[PDB]
Amino acid sequence: MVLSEGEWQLVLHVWAKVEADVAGHGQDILIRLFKSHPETLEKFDRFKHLKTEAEMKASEDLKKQGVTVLTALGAILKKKGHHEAELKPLAQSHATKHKIPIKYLEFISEAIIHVLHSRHPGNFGADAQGAMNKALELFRKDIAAKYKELGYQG
Ligand code: HEM
Numbered sequence: 001m002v003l004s005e006g007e008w009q010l011v012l013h014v015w016a017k018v019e020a021d022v023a024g025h026g027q028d029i030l031i032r033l034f035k036s037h038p039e040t041l042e043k044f045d046r047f048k049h050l051k052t053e054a055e056m057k058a059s060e061d062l063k064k065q066g067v068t069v070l071t072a073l074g075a076i077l078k079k080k081g082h083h084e085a086e087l088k089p090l091a092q093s094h095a096t097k098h099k100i101p102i103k104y105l106e107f108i109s110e111a112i113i114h115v116l117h118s119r120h121p122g123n124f125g126a127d128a129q130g131a132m133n134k135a136l137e138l139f140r141k142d143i144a145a146k147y148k149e150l151g152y153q154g
Pocket of ligand 1: 040
């Protein structure tokens, strides 16, 4: 798949809004993820013990990982599909170190779209959400194909 320049623009516009508060959005997304798909929290050795949303919210470690996730994602989106270099190390660690099934990347994709919709209704209408969704689908597709080359699930 391939996004048009129109589509990239919709994604980068809402993204520029996200980047006004990386840590806040990170936290919101990860929390959404953990609340919606609690099995995912188990993958995080450092924060697997967190029992409630309040505990999630007060975790400095959780807030650091949200910033890490978003910074890496942002760098990929800003590539506008030319992300081969960035995907390599992410695919390797997620497939062989962390062991993250594609299914889990679909779950965070869902948390991403949920938070953007909630926080940026003005810049996240139906066309922008379509474009975001295509952007993440490309990402997931390309990561799935690297998983396969690495010898893991796809
Ligand atoms: C938006 C898709 C994702 C991005 C861009 C992302 C990015 C990253 C980055 C940049 C790191 C640190 C470097 C590394 O280990 O490669 C990281 C670590 C990690 N990721 Fe992700 N990740 C994503 C999805 C997920 C999901 C869905 C999970 C689990 C459900 C996951 C689990 C982990 C874990 C367990 C680590 C190590 C945390 C620690 O330091 O113990 N990742 N991720």
